[PDB]
Amino acid sequence: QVINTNSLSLLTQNNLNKSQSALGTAIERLSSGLRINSAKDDAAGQAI
Amino acid sequence: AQVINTNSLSLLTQNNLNKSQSALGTAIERLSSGLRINSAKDDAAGQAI
Amino acid sequence: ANRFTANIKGLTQASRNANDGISIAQTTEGALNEINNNLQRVRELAVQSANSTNSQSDLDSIQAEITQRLNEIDRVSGQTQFNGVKVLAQDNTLTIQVG
Amino acid sequence: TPVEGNNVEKEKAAAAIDKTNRGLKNSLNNVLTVRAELGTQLSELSTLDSLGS
Amino acid sequence: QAQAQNSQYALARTFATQKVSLEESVLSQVTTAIQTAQEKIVYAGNGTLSDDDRASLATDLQGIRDQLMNLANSTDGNGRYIFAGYKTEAAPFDQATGGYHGGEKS
Amino acid sequence: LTSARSRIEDSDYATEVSNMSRAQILQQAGTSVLAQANQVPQNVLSLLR
Amino acid sequence: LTSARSRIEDSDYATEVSNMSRAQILQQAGTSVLAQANQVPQNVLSLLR
Amino acid sequence: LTSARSRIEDSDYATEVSNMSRAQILQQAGTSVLAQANQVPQNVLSLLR
Amino acid sequence: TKYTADDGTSKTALNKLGGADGKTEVVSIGGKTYAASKAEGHNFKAQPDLAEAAATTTENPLQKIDAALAQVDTLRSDLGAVQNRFNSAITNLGNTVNN
């Protein structure tokens, strides 16, 4: 079952997506100098 | 166990950083103002008297 | 593990609440310091006033200065704010959630 | 609901919030219990599948 | 069966460790609280603090006392109260008077 | 007000540096694992014919 | 009365200078140790799998 | 009149020195982060081919 | 002296001589006496809590000032204590989240 065999691969991929998104957010904040780059960071606190 | 995700040790270190941060802030504040009792947070009874 | 996660997130936001409280408290402290200074100067003027040597025009001048101090006091009372909400325009009661 | 200046409504909101927290915690424990039930089935099925082959 | 027994003791050690670590930290906080209380009492000794000054000190001590009350009724990572002994389901100390209601059997 | 805004807004040097490190290391590990997963088929490919 | 007020209010040049020194040294130390802590997980990465 | 014009015109050296330092620090942080950013994503790919 | 009066409308009142000196201008609404500058343009609809004009040389002023000052300092003390409670709570929260 290439899919059993590829279950492997596809699963492994998903995890990379999660890690990569986290890295993107981290570098974004580290570059900008702010925790709140968009209202997607903190919706209510952003308004405040 | 060689854990990746949590890295508990760094988390520990950050606390020790914050405590020192607070100490240095208080020292700079008092040394610049020339007063021990800058805020009312410092000494309530001292404030009043 | 899921319970641990829940408690962790709750506690972090509660810490942020504590910081909200420290912020509002410190703004109030700042305003009250100025109230105190004005009151001290007012006591100084009241001390001056009792001189029987003062002529009535001088007393009127002293009254002018006192009135301006009181105007500033009411300004401080009404107009100070935090986040858009006024703090001292009434006797007020507030609970912060720290747990 | 707006609350500034008015009494009662701030306190009513506070009590509602407290009830909210209690319910959320109890619900959390309940759904975790459901997870435990499902898990109890899951690996038992896996082991019985191996036993079956 | 011997290996499983050893695993059982391993789990027991894990679950004891998690609780004891917490209690240690909380008691450390309690200790620093009591130390600042002692500090304040020394101040009360000064026989030249006028009445309202003594009342200010009293407010400060009230704060320390109710903080200690917070610490006493603390809870674990599940929700149970630690210092209640066997009766983990209820806060052990009365908020008002400090009377104890939890278990006596450790 | 500046202090309060800072608390709401600003990002933590230490925390985000640590998170970036964790993410990079997990990324490397994930890719290497991915290569191994890709090899997994090759075993069954080679043995059979 | 001025003298008494001073005794209650003022700060000590020397004491607070010393406190600032302690806090600064602690801060630099903590930052260095934090860096090493972050490094360790990459050591475990050195497993190369 | 001179005092008034000065209040309107002059730059406050303390505030401007502070601003300059803040901006310089941000510039270094941004440059280093950018350096890491270029490498990490694209580089990690080559490990797979 | 003109103002937004009780009912919600804009009304005017004529001036009168008063004051501890007795030579300053006062104006009255509903039987409460005010000095012109304080009252002028005032929105009495919204701030009925507003000071009146004086009648006499205020005997014993310093006592009154001092009692007010004592209340101020009491409140400042309480705020400081509450701030310290918050700091301790923050410390504890950090420790607990780490654990």
DSSP codes joined into one string, I52-71: ----S--SSHHHHHHHHHHH
Whether C23 contacts chain F with CB within 8 A: yes
Q: Which residues fall within 8 angstroms of residue B34, CB to CB, at 6 or more apart?
A: G10, G11
Whether F7 contacts chain C with CB within 8 A: yes
| Of the candidates E65, C38, G12, G8, the residue with the CA atom closest to the CA atom of residue B45 | G8
Whether B39 contacts chain C with CB within 8 A: yes
- How close is the nearest chain G Cα to the Cα of B6, in Å? 10
| Secondary structure element (H or E) that encloses residue I2, with its range | strand I2-4
Whether E49 contacts chain B with CB within 8 A: yes
Give the number of C-E residue pairs with CB atoms closer than 8 Å: 6
User: Cα–Cα distance between C1 and C66 in angstroms, integer?
Assistant: 65
Q: Which residues fall within 8 angstroms of residue G11, CB to CB, at 6 or more apart?
A: B30, B31, B33, B34, B35, B36
User: Cα–Cα distance between A44 and B3 in angstroms, integer?
Assistant: 35
- How close is the nearest chain H Cα to the Cα of A31, in Å? 5
User: Cα–Cα distance between A40 and A35 in angstroms, integer?
Assistant: 11
The answer to whether the Cβ–Cβ distance between B40 and I98 falls below 8 Å is: no
The answer to whether the Cβ–Cβ distance between F11 and A29 falls below 8 Å is: yes
Which residues of chain F are within 8 Å of residue B17 when distances are taken between CB atoms?
Answer: 14
In the 8-state DSSP scheme, what is residue A39?
T
Q: Are A24 and F49 in contact (CB under 8 A)?
A: no
| Of the candidates C86, C49, C88, the residue with the CA atom closest to the CA atom of residue C66 | C49
Record the resolution, in angstroms: 2.9
Q: Do chains A and B touch (3 or more CB pairs under 8 A)?
A: no
Rg (CA), chain G: 22
User: Cα–Cα distance between E9 and E6 in angstroms, integer?
Assistant: 5
Residues constituting chain E = 106
Q: Are E67 and E30 in contact (CB under 8 A)?
A: no
Chain G residue with the nearest C-alpha to that of F21: G38
The answer to whether the Cβ–Cβ distance between C25 and I66 falls below 8 Å is: no
Residues constituting chain G = 49
Convert F13-47 to b/e letters by CB count within 10 Å (16 or more is b). ebbbbbbbbbbbbbbbbbbbbbeebeeeeeeeeee
Which of helix, strand or coil describes residue H5?
helix
Residue showing tokens 């001025």 = G2
| Secondary structure element (H or E) that encloses residue D29, with its range | helix D9-52
Residue showing tokens 């720290």 = C98
Chain B residue with the nearest C-alpha to that of G1: B49
User: Cα–Cα distance between D49 and I10 in angstroms, integer?
Assistant: 89
The answer to whether the Cβ–Cβ distance between C19 and F3 falls below 8 Å is: no
Q: Which of B33, B41, B43, B49 to mutate to test the interface with C (most CBs of C within 10 A)?
A: B41
The answer to whether the Cβ–Cβ distance between F15 and B5 falls below 8 Å is: no
Strand order in the sheet with I24-29: I16-18, I24-29, I32-35
In the 8-state DSSP scheme, what is residue E101?
-
State which approach was used to obtain the coordinates: cryo-EM
According to DSSP, the β-strands at I32-35 and I24-29 are antiparallel
In the 8-state DSSP scheme, what is residue C52?
T
User: Cα–Cα distance between C85 and H21 in angstroms, integer?
Assistant: 34
Q: Do chains B and G touch (3 or more CB pairs under 8 A)?
A: yes
In the 8-state DSSP scheme, what is residue E75?
B
Contacting partners of chain C (3+ CB pairs under 8 A): B, D, E, F, I
Query: Please, what is the angle between helix F13-48 and helix A2-32, to 10°?
Result: 160
Q: Are D1 and D12 in contact (CB under 8 A)?
A: no
Which of helix, strand or coil describes residue I30?
coil
In 10 A of CB E45, how many CB atoms? 7
The β-bridge partners of E100 are E93
Amino acid letter for position E98: G
The answer to whether the Cβ–Cβ distance between G41 and F28 falls below 8 Å is: no
Interface of C with I in 73-92 (CB under 8 A): none
User: Cα–Cα distance between C69 and F5 in angstroms, integer?
Assistant: 31
User: Cα–Cα distance between H7 and H1 in angstroms, integer?
Assistant: 10
Amino acid letter for position E43: Y
